Design a protein around this ligand. Structure first.
Ligand SMILES: CCCCCCCCCCCCCCCCCC(=O)OC[C@H](COP(=O)([O-])OCC(O)COP(=O)([O-])OC[C@@H](COC(=O)CCCCCCCCCCCCCCCCC)OC(=O)CCCCCCCCCCCCCCCCC)OC(=O)CCCCCCCCCCCCCCCCC
Ligand SMILES: CCCCCCCCCCCCCCCCCC(=O)OC[C@H](COP(=O)([O-])OCC(O)COP(=O)([O-])OC[C@@H](COC(=O)CCCCCCCCCCCCCCCCC)OC(=O)CCCCCCCCCCCCCCCCC)OC(=O)CCCCCCCCCCCCCCCCC
Ligand SMILES: CCCCCCCCCCCCCCCCCC(=O)OC[C@H](COP(=O)([O-])OCC(O)COP(=O)([O-])OC[C@@H](COC(=O)CCCCCCCCCCCCCCCCC)OC(=O)CCCCCCCCCCCCCCCCC)OC(=O)CCCCCCCCCCCCCCCCC
Ligand SMILES: CCCCCCCCCCCCCCCCCC(=O)OC[C@H](COP(=O)([O-])OCC(O)COP(=O)([O-])OC[C@@H](COC(=O)CCCCCCCCCCCCCCCCC)OC(=O)CCCCCCCCCCCCCCCCC)OC(=O)CCCCCCCCCCCCCCCCC
Ligand code: HEA
Ligand code: HEA
Ligand SMILES: CCCCCCCC/C=C\CCCCCCCC(=O)OC[C@H](COP(=O)(O)OCCN)OC(=O)CCCCCCCCCCCCCCC
Ligand SMILES: [Cu+2]
Ligand SMILES: [Cu+2]
Ligand SMILES: [Cu+2]
Lengths: 203, 46, 312, 145, 552, 139, 67
């Protein structure tokens, strides 16, 4: 050494700049969010047909579709959206601890959403439909179940970014990472508002 | 490079004078480690 | 000239095909009249070589010609607009949807061969009070009152209340020209009637593509459920004789082995065909009863074997 | 000041970006594209057991030949250990000139023998093969250190 | 006053500078070279697969290979020509020259481009991996219609490996889509606005848009199909809504997939023209709108593949397929205006560009001839449609990829090619290709429908199959000059020292060294218009470049 | 920037136009009813370009003219320090091997290989995303 | 038909056409310049071919000849 030639705040830099420059992981996750919205368009088209097919009282007889356990976990998940947005408010202002508290409770009630969805799947498969049992049961298990895989991947992103906040100095690059995971998971629970309006309310 | 997070907890920060004492002491200990190893390396050849 | 300019169609045998072939002739005249002037543009702008006397002095360097761009953004829109209007006026003449046909053929289309129906005949000449059978359409609506558990569910079925392995679309008939793997299925049809085709497949999508009808349709598995108007009428069929019919999607492996024939006979030959089949005879016997060669004449029922290097 | 006479321009720093008319080439070396690869092999692969940048000069040197060859050894990119060969087919003059630190490293009997092993092939009429038979000889002669 | 250059450059390179650098790629350059290499390897695999099919169709028996092997053969062939040859190379030229064209130091997510490439390669291997399986790979077509793909039908392991191979390849190409759109949005040289970027990075902007539109529905369709096969999950069930549930959203992937195929090769050819016509690209803003005018409608045109099913809204998709045929006609007449009154020289990548022009012309004439549904009611799944998508699609990817290789080859490896051997390559990939597909129009119009393993001697038309075989085996020996040319143009071949080995280069790429430095640029030029390399290299030209740039 | 917002606004106008005209032209004029399978695909491709264009418009309003985007901008007007790009990294090859093991577990229906490939995906994704954040070994 | 004809055709017409196009395109003179005739004077610019052999002014010696 003499001092360094890369005399910066860290080895990691923001992504370009963000005062007169757009954040680039921001626009990267925005267009990848848009791609995953088209993935959910594939799942929605697998739902909105195979509901035009079944006529009459079309959600079939073994599907006592539970709303009294659905709307609490949607309310948990969309309040957790505001907890995650408060986490990114505490990420712009640079303290790791305001980030980590709100993302810990966001991860906890997102895990509560995943466990509530898993208990809904157990309670709806043990006295009802299976994924080879019905048309509507199969499309219910895939249109919201792979959304369960989306939200469990978002939870993996939460615990992963929390270990990342444990291991390094809070750079503006790490606030970029935090805002990126923040509105990835905001996209997850706006797609779940769409799915909960679609499956349960609108039918 | 950038290896200085908050020393506080996983949820709550420690007061700032304690953070300064911990990171200055750990930085001086790592500096003393490479200093003692470098002066031993110079003792082998010199 | 008319066959070689039409990129070698088979000539039509129904007015549907005649009018479709006239529109293809007009459209390849339009396509060659575009491609001739644009290949003229390319093989005349290949007269703009790098000239040997052309010094260190670049071309006109222009770009950005707005009125010429408006002219050649308006004229292809005129070409596709007149081609779209002729397309729609021939799209009106693909299924007139006559509620009074003359003979209805229930072309069901199973795994790797065909089966033709003769669901209904009604001559405007006055003959053939003939109808379809329908005791065979029994369901697989699995409305069992209790499943593997003991109470409450009374599980009804996967799709619309029934199992996928259902076969209630699959209409049958007394007359059935079934096609085995060594005898090609021979539909025979009266010349100059209104011949409706209702299309069903037992297993998998493929295509009712007679080459000389100049038309096809896909036998979707449950086409009423899948928004598929499978049925289409054929307006007449002028030319008699035998016509090949291929299979024009993907079925699985034995897919070129799905040929059929639509042999167009005279109406009195159609009389003597079915009235020598209501007294129950098979396909070869019924075709021998009307002085016409019984086996498939435009396609042989080719090899049940698998190759020219398999040991027989 | 003049650039390349058409199409080149010096960039925002000193790198002069030039062009090449589309069917034409860049180097225009009047030798085949395979035997000067043999020259580069004899001058890099089978030379690194001598530890000296073997320069090869083919241009004109129409002056006092030793002085104008040791002057153009001074831009060989390390002149203290470089064994330049200069040949002038306008003038028929071989001239092998050394760098400083190449001195007594098997070299005083290798320079006239290198000139002989070159000029035995130049009088046939092979420029590149003469350079190859010279650089292989001076690679066998100059000992590393 | 004189430099000190090596007589020839480094031939192979030192021992061991690439194979770890394979594993730990982060610049766009070497990743794009790897795209071009391994995808021409998959092009070789597909070409021999097609030559197996075309040995098979030469005689009317099943003389060479079976029925089932043929049905695997066209399927794996259609994928390793569409989803594992074209679909990667549309980002392979992006990783070649798009950060060079927009002034970017690297591509924007420089590990996620390695992730895109390696997910591509390990989706491609696990989709080819049906051939190790004893029942073989997918016998159902590339179209892969759902009553044939659900596990009752085609029950083998090769279809499942095909499904998850396209899952991985689709994810990798989505990730290529996001990092290319973020390069062109927010990683760009400081003097160029949106409009004086090159046309090729514009086509990859809109191409990556349509990748993000299309390919997640391929993964959604295909996760639904993997669930419907393994869990028996009734989504694509035929007595359900699930045979147009395949066709609607699969072709909603499929036709935007063939236009993410078609658009950056239009960008390649539109970059070929202004450096060999020695002049502007004609109507540059016209192309910069026409790419959107074709690609927005590419999404909304999707069901012009189910004319035969009788279950689509038929005048809507016919009208919009004519309306997607008009802006590519605009994009074409701009090219004819670009060659117009220029000083042409037909050195080899422009020669491939002109071959593309002729093939894509008469193929697109078959496009407007085929998109009208009564003219398609006989032609759906005939050989007129297979000669149509070859005579278009081969023309786009293969001819414009050979234009792209013979153009961006001296700037991605610093050495030229043999011009004579490239002209040999062109003329027997032109004569051979027209020999094997000018007759399949007349072979699909008279009856021989697609995806047949054999036909009959009492059926006619044996001579047109044997002349397609003659043409296809001219095309099979056509890349012996190509792989010989790049094989003796990397490790040997005519080097370039100065920039612009193609003179009158432009588009901000050609203002750096022919092996470009790590992070692409030692000196950027003052970007003023669409051709800033042409304005660096020709400063006296600029007033003549602008003073007559508006008349026509 | 400005022009990406206008670009995806053009794509949003056309995708919304095509979505609503496909819904109201397959409401009538079709065999059974609304197709529901390209209709919602068009509604959510309108959603795709809504998300991209709305975010680019949010950025473009909360920004000045960028010294990149400005027409007639010298290179010295925007020559600062860019952000971190990653150098050499051997994690994406491990991402692909992990996701390919998970995919061939999901193809050859091997649930042990699905779970193991997902575990390798988590491990290699951690190795990618922590790669420029592991501190030195504290001993 | 006549399997010798439709195998010799598809195996020879590619090789016949390959031989014809490779004898009309590869027998042209390439872009590479001709080898230097020794009797002709040195028309080229001066050439120094360095080595880069160990990677990173005062006189060493001398020798001469006259071919
Ligand atoms: C239905 C399905 C639903 C599933 C939902 C999806 C969730 C699954 C995804 C999870 C897996 C993703 C990948 C794992 C990420 C690991 C990345 C990493 O390596 O971090 C390095 C990072 C490096 O920091 P560093 O100081 O710079 O590096 C120097 C070394 O660490 C020097 O070493 P050291 O001595 O300094 O390390 C100290 C460590 C040393 O101890 C160890 O070595 C542990 C070894 C592994 C234990 C497991 C083995 C025992 C059981 C085996 C059973 C086998 C069967 O002791 C600690 O554990 C301290 C706690 C700090 C935890 C911070 C990490 C992020 C937490 C995220 C919050 C989530 C909610 C929790 C709430 C927090 C408190 C309120 O920090 C760590 O070392 C982490 C230690 C191990 C923790 C791993 C992750 C645990 C959190 C998972 C939560 C699961 C749900 C919770 C539910 C609510 C509570 C019950
Ligand atoms: C726009 C550009 C042009 C477009 C592309 C055109 C492509 C057309 C078709 C292809 C023909 C092109 C000619 C190819 C011959 C190359 C001649 C040349 O001068 O290139 C030097 C040229 C100069 O490179 P360099 O840095 O100066 O030093 C190269 C030295 O050789 C030092 O390298 P190294 O010492 O670090 O490692 C040497 C090793 C490194 O290469 C490899 O290990 C991967 C090659 C995979 C071979 C798989 C064949 C099956 O090379 C070999 O493997 C040689 C054996 C080849 C086996 C083929 C058997 C055929 C019978 O190389 C390149 O720039 C091209 C890079 C190619 C990337 C390879 C893409 C493969 C993707 C990953 C492979 C991992 C899976 C494979 C399984 C594991 C077993 C290996
Ligand atoms: C669907 C397939 C999922 C693919 C997920 C990745 C696609 C995202 C691409 C665009 C987003 C922005 C981006 O370029 O990421 C930067 C980064 C590229 O690094 P780089 O090129 O060196 O540039 C430096 C960064 O820009 C410097 O920025 P950075 O390093 O701060 O990156 C910001 C942020 C990037 O934040 C995000 O991208 C959002 C995280 C969403 C992914 C969660 C999984 C969703 C799908 C689950 C269902 C399948 O990184 C994070 O901290 C979170 C990463 C968490 C990834 C978790 C993936 C685990 C998948 C398995 C879940 C198990 C459940 C299934 C059973 O990519 C990643 O971090 C993700 C790794 C790729 C995983 C592919 C899996 C195969
Ligand atoms: C039904 C089945 C039941 C099974 C029953 C039997 C199972 C037995 C259970 C065994 C119980 C586990 C024992 C505790 C292990 C303690 C590890 C630890 O805390 O070290 C912290 C260590 C940091 O300490 P450090 O090495 O001093 O860091 C300074 C270095 O610069 C950092 O090193 P570096 O900078 O030179 O290289 C960086 C490298 C660090 O790489 C590593 O240190 C780990 C690599 C080990 C793999 C070696 C195999 C090579 C394969 C070829 O980064 C990474 O690779 C990130 C990977 C993160 C892994 C987390 C995902 C776990 C999900 C698996 C499920 O970070 C880790 O090793 C990551 C482990 C995360 C927590 C462990 C939880 C996973 C296992 C629990 C299952 C529930
Ligand atoms: C590179 C990929 C590519 C491209 C660019 C195309 C470009 C076109 N394709 Fe082709 N097509 C396929 C790859 C392509 N296609 C594939 C892979 C399939 C499906 C595989 C299968 O099902 O088996 C396919 C299937 C296909 C079908 C499916 C029907 C069937 O299965 O039978 C149709 C018809 O609608 C079709 C029509 C077109 C049209 C109208 C264009 C238009 O974009 C072309 C327009 C171009 C010209 C029109 C412009 C230039 C001419 C003039 C200079 C100006 C214009 C003049 C006119 C106004 C007359 N294509
Ligand atoms: C992307 C464009 C593309 C390309 C490049 C190809 C490459 C070729 N295709 Fe393929 N083709 C399709 C688009 C393409 N195809 C599509 C969309 C399908 C449909 C899939 C489906 O229907 O389901 C298809 C399937 C297909 C069929 C199937 C229709 C049927 O079964 O009836 C036919 C007809 O013969 C065909 C003709 C050819 C020909 C002659 C080539 C030629 O270019 C041949 C190329 C291969 C050689 C040039 C390589 C040379 C051989 C090597 C030198 C051998 C040695 C190499 C090893 C060392 C690795 N193609
Ligand atoms: C490929 C992925 C496709 C879709 C994923 C959907 C995720 C959502 C999971 C659906 C949950 C559900 O409700 O499953 C109910 C039924 C119960 O029926 P049974 O067993 O017959 O009952 C017994 C009566 N005697 O699932 C079943 O069949 C049993 C299997 C359980 C779900 C399948 C595995 C879940 C995760 C898939 C792995 C993803 C890999 C991705 C790799 C890229
Ligand atoms: Cu069939
Ligand atoms: Cu299409
Ligand atoms: Cu079709």
């Amino acid at each position: 050494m003499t001092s360094a030639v890369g005399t910066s705040g860290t080895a990691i830099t923001s992504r370009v700049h963000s005062l007169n420059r757009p954040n680039m992981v921001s626009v990267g996750t925005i267009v990848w969010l848009s791609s995953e919205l088209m993935f959910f368009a594939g799942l929605f088209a697998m739902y909105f047909t195979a509901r035009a097919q079944a006529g009459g009282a079309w959600p079939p007889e073994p599907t006592e579709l539970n709303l009294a356990l659905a709307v609490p976990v949607t309310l948990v998940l969309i309040a957790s959206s505001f907890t995650c947005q408060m986490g990114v408010f505490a990420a712009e202002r640079g303290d790791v601890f305001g980030l980590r508290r709100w993302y810990v409770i966001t991860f906890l009630m997102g895990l509560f959403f995943v466990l509530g969805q898993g208990y809904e799947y157990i309670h709806l498969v043990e006295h009802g439909t299976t994924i080879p049992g019905s048309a509507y049961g199969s499309v219910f298990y895939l249109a919201t179940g792979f959304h369960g895989l989306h939200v469990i991947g978002g939870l993996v992103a939460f615990v992963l970014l929390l270990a990342r906040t444990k291991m390094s100095k809070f750079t503006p690059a790490q606030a970029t990472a935090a805002i990126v995971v923040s509105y990835y998971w905001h996209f997850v629970d706006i797609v779940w508002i769409a799915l909960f309006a679609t499956i349960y309310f609108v039918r | 490079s950038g290896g200085a997070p908050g020393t506080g907890s996983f949820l709550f920060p420690d007061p700032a004078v304690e953070h300064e004492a911990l990171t200055e002491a750990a930085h001086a200990s790592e500096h003393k480690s490479l200093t003692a190893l470098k002066e031993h390396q110079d003792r082998i050849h010199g | 000239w008319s066959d070689a300019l039409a990129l070698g169609w088979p000539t039509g045998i129904t007015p549907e095909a005649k009018l479709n072939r006239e529109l293809w002739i007009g459209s390849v005249i339009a396509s060659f009249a575009v491609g001739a002037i644009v290949w003229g543009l390319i093989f005349w702008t290949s007269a703009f070589h790098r000239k040997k006397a052309t010094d260190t002095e670049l071309p006109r360097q222009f770009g950005y010609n707005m009125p010429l761009e408006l002219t050649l953004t308006v004229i292809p829109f005129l070409i596709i607009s007149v081609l779209f209007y002729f397309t729609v006026v021939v799209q009106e003449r693909m299924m007139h949807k006559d509620p009074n046909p003359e003979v209805v053929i229930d072309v069901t289309a199973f795994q790797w061969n065909w089966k033709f129906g003769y669901q209904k005949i009604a001559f405007a000449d006055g003959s053939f009070d003939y109808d379809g059978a329908d005791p065979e359409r029994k369901e697989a609506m699995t409305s069992r009152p209790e499943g593997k558990d003991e109470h409450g569910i009374e599980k009804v079925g996967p799709i619309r209340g029934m199992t996928p392995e259902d076969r209630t679309y699959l209409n049958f008939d007394k007359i059935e020209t079934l096609g085995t793997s060594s005898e090609i299925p021979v539909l025979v049809l009266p010349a100059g009637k209104r011949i409706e085709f209702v299309l069903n497949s037992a297993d998998v999508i493929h295509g009712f593509w007679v080459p000389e009808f100049l038309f096809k349709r896909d036998v979707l598995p449950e086409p009423k459920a899948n928004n598929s108007d499978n049925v289409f009428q054929v307006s007449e069929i002028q030319q008699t004789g035998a016509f090949v019919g291929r299979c024009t999607e993907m079925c699985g492996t034995f897919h070129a082995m799905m040929n059929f024939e639509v042999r167009v006979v005279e109406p009195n030959d159609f009389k003597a065909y079915i009235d020598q089949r209501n007294a129950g005879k098979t396909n070869a016997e019924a075709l021998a009863a009307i002085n016409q060669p019984p086996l498939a004449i435009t396609t042989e029922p080719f090899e049940s074997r698998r190759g020219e290097l398999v040991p027989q | 000041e003049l650039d390349l006479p058409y199409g080149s321009a010096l960039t925002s720093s000193g790198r002069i970006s030039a062009v090449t008319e589309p069917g034409e080439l860049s180097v225009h070396y009047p030798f085949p594209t395979m035997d000067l690869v043999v020259l580069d092999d004899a001058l890099k692969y089978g030379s690194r057991a001598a530890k000296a940048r073997f320069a090869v000069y083919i241009g004109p040197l129409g002056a006092d030949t030793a002085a104008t060859a040791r002057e153009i050894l001074a831009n060989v990119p390390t002149p203290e250990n470089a064994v330049l060969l200069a040949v002038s087919p306008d003038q028929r003059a071989i001239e092998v000139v050394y760098g400083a630190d190449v001195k007594g490293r098997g070299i005083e009997s290798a320079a006239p023998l290198g000139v002989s092993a070159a000029a035995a092939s130049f009088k046939e009429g092979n420029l590149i093969d003469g350079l190859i038979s010279a650089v292989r000889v001076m690679s066998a002669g100059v000992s590393p250190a | 006053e004189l430099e000190a250059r090596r007589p020839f450059p480094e031939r192979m390179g030192p021992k061991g500078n690439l194979i770890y650098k394979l594993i730990t790629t982060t610049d766009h350059k070497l990743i794009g070279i790897m795209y071009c290499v391994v995808c021409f390897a998959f092009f070789l695999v597909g070409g021999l697969m097609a030559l197996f099919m075309r040995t098979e169709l030469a005689m009317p028996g099943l003389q060479f290979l079976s029925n089932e092997q043929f049905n695997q053969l066209f399927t794996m062939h259609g994928t390793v020509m569409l989803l594992f040859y074209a679909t990667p190379i549309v980002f392979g030229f992006a990783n070649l020259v798009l950060p060079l064209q927009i002034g970017a130091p690297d591509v924007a997510f420089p590990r996620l481009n390695a992730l895109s490439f390696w997910l591509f390669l390990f989706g491609a291997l696990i989709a080819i991996a049906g051939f190790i399986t004893p029942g073989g790979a997918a016998d159902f077509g590339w179209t892969a219609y759902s009553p044939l793909t659900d596990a009752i039908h085609s029950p083998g392991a090769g279809g499942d490996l095909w499904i998850m191979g396209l899952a991985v390849g689709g994810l990798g190409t989505i990730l290529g889509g996001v990092n290319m759109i973020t390069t062109v949005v927010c990683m760009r040289a400081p003097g160029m606005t949106m409009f004086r970027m090159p046309i090729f990075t514009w086509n990859i902007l809109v191409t990556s848009i349509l990748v993000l539109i299309a390919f997640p529905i391929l993964t959604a369709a295909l996760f639904g199909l993997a669930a419907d096969r393994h869990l028996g999950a009734h989504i694509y069930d035929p007595a359900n809504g699930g045979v147009l549930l395949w066709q609607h959203l699969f072709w909603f992937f499929g036709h935007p997939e063939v236009y993410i195929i078609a658009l950056p090769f239009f960008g390649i050819v539109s970059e070929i023209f202004p450096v060999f016509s020695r002049k502007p690209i004609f109507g540059y803003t016209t192309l910069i709108y026409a790419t959107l005018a074709i690609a927005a409608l590419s999404v909304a045109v999707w069901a012009h593949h189910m004319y035969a099913t009788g279950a689509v809204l038929l005048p809507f998709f016919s009208f919009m397929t004519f309306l997607i045929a008009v802006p590519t006609g605009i994009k074409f007449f701009n090219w004819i205006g670009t060659m117009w009154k220029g000083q042409l020289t037909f050195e080899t990548p422009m020669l491939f560009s002109v071959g593309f022009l002729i093939t894509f012309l008469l193929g697109g004439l078959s496009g407007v001839l085929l998109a009208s549904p009564p003219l398609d009611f006989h032609v759906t799944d005939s050989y007129f449609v297979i000669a149509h998508f070859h005579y278009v699609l081969f023309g786009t990817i293969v001819f414009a990829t050979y234009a792209g290789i013979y153009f961006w080859f001296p700037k991605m490896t610093g050495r030229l090619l043999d011009e004579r051997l490239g002209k040999l390559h062109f003329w027997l990939t032109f004569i051979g290709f027209h020999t094997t597909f000018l007759v399949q129009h007349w072979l699909g119009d008279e009856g021989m429908p697609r995806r047949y393993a054999d036909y009959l001697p009492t059926d006619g038309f044996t001579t047109l199959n044997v002349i397609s075989t003659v043409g296809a085996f001219i095309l099979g020996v056509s890349m012996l000059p190509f792989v010989w040319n790049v094989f003796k143009s990397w490790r040997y071949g005519e080097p370039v020292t100065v920039d612009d080995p193609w003179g009158y280069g432009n588009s901000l790429e050609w203002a750096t060294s022919c092996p470009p430095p790590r992070h692409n640029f030692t000196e950027l030029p003052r970007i003023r218009s669409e051709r800033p390399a042409f304005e660096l290299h020709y400063p006296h030209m600029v007033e003549r470049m602008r003073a007559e740039a508006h008349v026509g | 920037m400005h022009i990406e917002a206008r670009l995806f606004e053009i794509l949003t106008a056309f995708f919304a136009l095509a979505a609503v005209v496909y819904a109201v032209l397959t409401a009538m004029f079709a065999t059974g009813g609304v197709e529901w399978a390209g209709t919602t695909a068009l509604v959510l491709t309108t959603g795709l370009t809504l998300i991209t264009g709305t975010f680019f418009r949010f950025v473009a309003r909360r920004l000045d003219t960028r010294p990149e985007d400005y027409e007639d901008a010298e290179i010295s007007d925007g020559a600062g320090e860019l952000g971190f790009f990653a150098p050499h990294s051997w994690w994406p090859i491990l991402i692909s091997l992990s996701f390919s093991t998970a995919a061939v577990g999901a193809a050859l229906w091997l649930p042990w290989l699905i779970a193991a490939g997902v575990a390798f995906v988590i491990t290699s994704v951690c190795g990618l995303v922590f790669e420029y954040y592991w501190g030195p070994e504290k001993h | 038909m006549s399997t010798a004809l439709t195998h010799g055709l598809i195996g020879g017409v590619p090789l016949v056409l390959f031989a014809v196009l490779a004898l009309i395109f590869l027998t042209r003179k390439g872009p590479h310049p001709d080898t230097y005739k020794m009797s002709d004077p040195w028309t080229h610019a001066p050439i120094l071919w360095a080595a880069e052999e160990p990677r990173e002014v005062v006189i060493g010696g001398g020798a001469s000849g006259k071919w």
